[PDB]
């Protein structure tokens, strides 16, 4: 869980050095090199690829959060049924008779 | 010019490069990190060609000087294992004659000198070294008979260098990388103290950028400049004609490669992986890690 | 701004995930209304819980096994803190242990009724 | 007659630049900068990074600049981004009061009438109290806020429940 | 608790740093050179370690084409380069579009 | 559950008002102003967004 949150954030960060077909990945290069009309066509390429990267990150995070919610619901159920009770449900609270 | 009336050429010997010929790829500091880069590098465990300069004393006293013209290809790792400063410099170009511009690099014993000219190089190019008995000093001469149409020159800050011939094991390792890219002739170097009878040492070492020269010329061939002593390697002998102190050098060609470089806290490159070497090295580059777990 | 709502939509989604992390932790650990203390005399019939109970000599009331478990594991991006601290999670966990070893399952359904541990 | 001026941008430090003039150098302040054409905005600090003599710039794990060499004095400067955070407004809600407290999330209070450094950020407009209560409004890192008595917004470490032996 | 906006520490002033070099680049030895190359042997000059006042070139009324591809010609004085190659030749005016 | 689905549909309906880099949000206005060859260059940006 720790490794996946790090790996996903590192992928989001390293997508900032992608060109997406612009003259540079660095937004200050475009704005220090080019005028009003030349710059914005390059800015729109970075916007599109950065937005695509960010939509992808948030979609992986929603799918990943649903796995953690399913895990936490199971944990909360084992807290009730295994710690706050004696379960008769086979293999819910370890192997053998709980 | 020098005129050697006798010379015996040996066939090309080979030795293993181990993990040598890595250099700092760019002018960027990086610390406590693993970084993946694509450049011309010496492939790990590749065969490097070995050459020698030696004098063997006897009733058939044999004098050997390996200084052939060699291909440059896209660039060259060069290393020398030496007891004394016998390797002095290099010539680089295409024809190596007055019809085309050639780069000359030479350590004269006070300064490195660099030139790009239509050189009339000597038929065998060497540094003629001799002891001037009245001045009590060494002198250097004899790489070319003329130079024309020069397009670059540079001279280093001054230094002092010992030219006396020393006995025992090889004491100095010098390592160089030469590249000719985008019109820039790039040089990287390192020096390491050693104590070896023969061959390159095992172990890892990274060459620092030495200089970057905007020369523009097409280089396809090169040649090493060796010192030839007119007289004795040390005072009080009674031999005759030219001599050279015992020196060995190693030549390895660079190839387009992907490497994963390890930088410590001090931002020194402390280790590397050649990603094309073997399936484990490709796994280390795939994981961006020097350790691979069970899997 | 030509793209309309896409950033507000992405931030609403990440905010919803962040609020769920607190809910998840609360539904697992906040299963007791009272912080149960374990008695100062540990007379649990010969059963020994010292490695899973707190040691007060530590700067937090983690157990020995919790101290082991805790040793094992700028570009507009931020990490928000959890609502409950690891100290508060250890206090809930400590109350769940003390409830179970002093009162069996009774604290799970009502007030904690003491029972001897071998009797439990 | 035709002249093609062909350019290479920064890789090494630049050697050809336009006819601009340098400013003096200021440190420990948020500024814009331009070193050799490498523009940015950040806080400049004297570095302890051991650049080798040929090296001009320094980079983080992210492949982003975090140190630089000044062209005029060959000393190394650490580059830190000028600080940012979420601003969140804390309220008992309009039907109870128009009172609010404000959290500068992950911000130190020196960067920003009650002021309080929580671990969640600098909290402003909430009275810190030594007592502990049920969590009313969550702030993070064990802190909660509530509206209580003469009324004020209070900030406190939350209690987990009634202590029982 | 409602996330209403973001905070930003805005910059108080702008720094400029460039090397203490003062010599202008030798563009006269390109644009006012006596004779140019035949285009098949197009003549290259590398320019380095100097101040390039491109406002001189762009305000010259004589140039019938002045056409930048990766920069705007007004931005050139605001900018820096590792190296520049000025490549000179003569061609027929109707062929200038091919460059 | 009601509020989330209402908010998702409101966000979807408000996205029709975005230009996405076209000269207008309004498709009939592009087609009223421009002849086919130039209109379709604007329509493609509305389609993409």
XYZ file of N, CA and C in Angstrom, chain D residues 40-146:
321
model
N 13.373 31.082 -12.840
C 12.585 30.406 -11.815
C 12.067 31.362 -10.749
N 11.367 30.811 -9.763
C 10.930 31.529 -8.564
C 11.132 30.630 -7.352
N 11.715 31.150 -6.280
C 12.068 30.352 -5.111
C 12.792 31.147 -4.038
N 13.165 30.457 -2.969
C 13.982 30.963 -1.866
C 15.405 30.452 -2.055
N 16.386 31.355 -2.026
C 17.806 31.041 -2.223
C 18.544 30.973 -0.881
N 19.295 29.900 -0.658
C 20.045 29.640 0.582
C 21.462 29.191 0.244
N 22.460 29.519 1.063
C 23.833 29.057 0.827
C 23.920 27.531 0.979
N 24.341 26.838 -0.077
C 24.341 25.380 -0.124
C 25.512 24.735 0.618
N 25.284 23.544 1.170
C 26.328 22.613 1.610
C 26.535 21.427 0.633
N 25.911 21.448 -0.555
C 26.095 20.433 -1.605
C 27.478 20.558 -2.254
N 28.229 19.457 -2.281
C 29.620 19.381 -2.760
C 29.703 19.242 -4.283
N 29.286 20.265 -5.034
C 29.456 20.277 -6.494
C 30.933 20.060 -6.855
N 31.216 19.177 -7.809
C 32.551 19.028 -8.393
C 32.852 20.261 -9.271
N 34.118 20.643 -9.507
C 34.459 21.932 -10.122
C 33.806 22.232 -11.481
N 33.572 21.218 -12.312
C 32.917 21.359 -13.617
C 31.384 21.510 -13.559
N 30.730 21.198 -12.434
C 29.266 21.139 -12.326
C 28.634 22.517 -12.088
N 27.518 22.796 -12.764
C 26.863 24.109 -12.782
C 25.517 24.159 -12.033
N 24.749 23.071 -12.050
C 23.380 22.977 -11.528
C 23.221 21.686 -10.734
N 22.260 21.603 -9.819
C 21.995 20.399 -9.034
C 20.523 20.020 -9.061
N 20.225 18.716 -9.082
C 18.858 18.203 -9.253
C 18.442 17.166 -8.219
N 17.171 17.243 -7.845
C 16.466 16.330 -6.947
C 16.099 14.997 -7.645
N 15.582 14.023 -6.888
C 15.132 12.701 -7.376
C 14.086 12.822 -8.506
N 13.261 13.867 -8.442
C 12.236 14.217 -9.419
C 12.772 14.687 -10.792
N 14.093 14.848 -10.959
C 14.752 15.503 -12.105
C 14.312 16.969 -12.270
N 14.333 17.691 -11.146
C 14.058 19.130 -11.026
C 15.232 19.835 -10.352
N 15.523 21.077 -10.747
C 16.607 21.868 -10.147
C 16.327 22.152 -8.679
N 17.309 21.913 -7.818
C 17.264 22.311 -6.412
C 18.567 22.953 -5.917
N 19.551 23.152 -6.796
C 20.693 24.011 -6.532
C 21.291 24.594 -7.818
N 22.025 25.696 -7.694
C 22.604 26.461 -8.806
C 23.953 27.047 -8.409
N 24.825 27.296 -9.386
C 26.035 28.108 -9.255
C 25.783 29.505 -9.817
N 26.071 30.550 -9.049
C 26.037 31.927 -9.565
C 27.178 32.141 -10.592
N 26.925 32.712 -11.785
C 27.981 32.976 -12.757
C 29.054 33.949 -12.260
N 28.719 34.891 -11.373
C 29.661 35.932 -10.957
C 30.549 35.476 -9.797
N 29.963 34.962 -8.720
C 30.690 34.321 -7.621
C 30.361 32.838 -7.630
N 31.367 31.969 -7.744
C 31.178 30.541 -8.057
C 30.700 29.693 -6.855
N 29.956 30.296 -5.933
C 29.305 29.637 -4.801
C 27.984 28.970 -5.213
N 27.572 27.965 -4.440
C 26.387 27.153 -4.732
C 25.218 27.577 -3.846
N 24.056 27.770 -4.455
C 22.825 28.165 -3.787
C 21.811 27.029 -3.856
N 21.310 26.583 -2.709
C 20.130 25.725 -2.636
C 18.898 26.522 -3.059
N 18.061 25.929 -3.904
C 16.795 26.493 -4.361
C 15.662 25.710 -3.703
N 14.808 26.411 -2.965
C 13.603 25.867 -2.326
C 12.381 26.564 -2.919
N 11.291 25.869 -3.276
C 10.107 26.525 -3.823
C 9.459 27.443 -2.783
N 8.966 28.611 -3.198
C 8.204 29.472 -2.295
C 6.928 28.759 -1.846
N 6.596 28.841 -0.559
C 5.615 27.929 0.036
C 4.175 28.165 -0.424
N 3.414 27.079 -0.370
C 2.032 26.971 -0.802
C 1.280 26.027 0.133
N -0.040 26.106 0.137
C -0.876 25.148 0.844
C -2.350 25.368 0.583
N -3.179 24.407 0.953
C -4.621 24.616 0.997
C -4.983 25.622 2.084
N -5.968 26.460 1.811
C -6.625 27.287 2.812
C -7.989 26.683 3.052
N -8.274 26.334 4.303
C -9.602 25.871 4.672
C -10.194 26.662 5.805
N -11.482 26.906 5.676
C -12.256 27.721 6.587
C -13.084 26.786 7.438
N -13.009 26.990 8.737
C -13.614 26.190 9.787
C -14.768 27.002 10.335
N -15.961 26.427 10.429
C -17.119 27.156 10.943
C -18.110 26.259 11.680
N -18.794 26.768 12.723
C -19.973 26.128 13.292
C -21.224 26.209 12.402
N -21.136 26.874 11.253
C -22.218 27.011 10.289
C -23.092 28.230 10.549
N -23.589 28.828 9.475
C -24.177 30.176 9.432
C -25.395 30.330 10.340
N -26.205 29.275 10.461
C -27.352 29.225 11.369
C -26.949 29.329 12.857
N -25.741 28.892 13.228
C -25.166 29.107 14.563
C -24.413 30.433 14.661
N -23.458 30.711 13.768
C -22.637 31.929 13.823
C -21.989 32.285 12.481
N -21.620 33.557 12.301
C -20.724 34.019 11.236
C -19.234 34.009 11.660
N -18.914 33.508 12.856
C -17.541 33.197 13.262
C -16.907 32.134 12.355
N -15.609 32.288 12.095
C -14.772 31.307 11.397
C -13.357 31.290 11.959
N -12.683 30.160 11.809
C -11.241 30.023 11.962
C -10.666 29.536 10.633
N -9.385 29.753 10.387
C -8.766 29.477 9.095
C -7.499 28.682 9.303
N -7.350 27.624 8.521
C -6.197 26.757 8.532
C -5.399 26.947 7.243
N -4.127 27.296 7.401
C -3.113 27.316 6.360
C -2.375 25.985 6.398
N -2.838 25.039 5.588
C -2.479 23.628 5.684
C -1.013 23.387 5.334
N -0.262 22.768 6.242
C 1.166 22.497 6.073
C 2.064 23.738 6.063
N 1.538 24.904 6.451
C 2.242 26.194 6.479
C 2.711 26.499 7.900
N 3.934 26.989 8.064
C 4.420 27.489 9.349
C 3.866 28.903 9.602
N 3.438 29.223 10.821
C 2.791 30.500 11.119
C 3.631 31.748 10.797
N 4.959 31.643 10.714
C 5.827 32.760 10.293
C 5.671 33.132 8.813
N 5.183 32.217 7.977
C 5.006 32.407 6.534
C 3.717 33.168 6.181
N 2.720 33.157 7.070
C 1.378 33.707 6.831
C 1.374 35.228 6.999
N -7.599 36.878 15.855
C -6.285 37.329 16.321
C -5.464 36.223 16.994
N -6.092 35.098 17.348
C -5.413 33.905 17.856
C -4.616 33.216 16.738
N -3.405 32.744 17.031
C -2.548 31.988 16.105
C -1.980 30.759 16.815
N -1.994 29.601 16.159
C -1.653 28.320 16.774
C -1.056 27.362 15.739
N 0.194 26.968 15.954
C 0.867 25.964 15.146
C 0.425 24.541 15.525
N -0.641 24.052 14.898
C -0.908 22.609 14.823
C 0.090 21.928 13.873
N 0.139 20.591 13.870
C 0.830 19.798 12.842
C 0.093 19.757 11.495
N -1.222 19.981 11.475
C -2.001 20.102 10.242
C -1.711 21.395 9.465
N -1.177 22.419 10.127
C -0.833 23.717 9.561
C -0.991 24.839 10.576
N -0.734 26.070 10.171
C -1.032 27.219 11.005
C -2.540 27.460 11.067
N -3.105 27.412 12.267
C -4.505 27.679 12.535
C -4.633 29.075 13.128
N -5.558 29.857 12.596
C -5.756 31.259 12.933
C -7.227 31.491 13.254
N -7.511 32.242 14.312
C -8.876 32.559 14.736
C -9.540 31.535 15.665
N -8.805 30.528 16.154
C -9.273 29.558 17.149
C -8.472 29.640 18.459
N -9.171 29.695 19.584
C -8.612 29.681 20.931
C -8.142 28.264 21.305
N -6.840 28.040 21.454
C -6.345 26.756 21.939
C -6.712 26.544 23.418
N -7.276 25.389 23.768
C -7.638 25.035 25.150
C -6.958 23.748 25.609
N -6.590 23.684 26.891
C -5.862 22.546 27.470
C -6.747 21.316 27.723
N -8.064 21.503 27.804
C -9.048 20.431 27.910
C -9.144 19.588 26.627
N -9.807 18.438 26.730
C -10.049 17.504 25.628
C -11.522 17.125 25.583
N -12.089 17.057 24.384
C -13.503 16.760 24.139
C -13.658 15.781 22.976
N -14.870 15.279 22.755
C -15.234 14.621 21.499
C -14.842 15.489 20.285
N -14.372 14.882 19.194
C -14.102 15.619 17.964
C -15.386 16.185 17.348
N -15.516 17.508 17.323
C -16.632 18.206 16.700
C -16.372 18.449 15.200
N -15.379 19.280 14.870
C -14.858 19.469 13.516
C -13.427 18.926 13.482
N -13.071 18.002 12.582
C -11.706 17.504 12.482
C -10.767 18.537 11.854
N -9.557 18.695 12.383
C -8.490 19.484 11.741
C -7.386 18.577 11.207
N -7.051 17.517 11.937
C -5.977 16.580 11.621
C -4.955 16.501 12.744
N -4.129 15.460 12.754
C -3.070 15.230 13.741
C -3.525 15.319 15.213
N -4.700 14.774 15.516
C -5.328 14.747 16.830
C -6.096 16.006 17.220
N -6.029 17.077 16.430
C -6.709 18.332 16.732
C -8.118 18.334 16.146
N -9.056 18.847 16.931
C -10.408 19.171 16.516
C -10.771 20.594 16.960
N -11.765 21.185 16.309
C -12.316 22.482 16.656
C -13.809 22.417 16.943
N -14.277 23.272 17.845
C -15.681 23.396 18.241
C -16.028 24.847 18.567
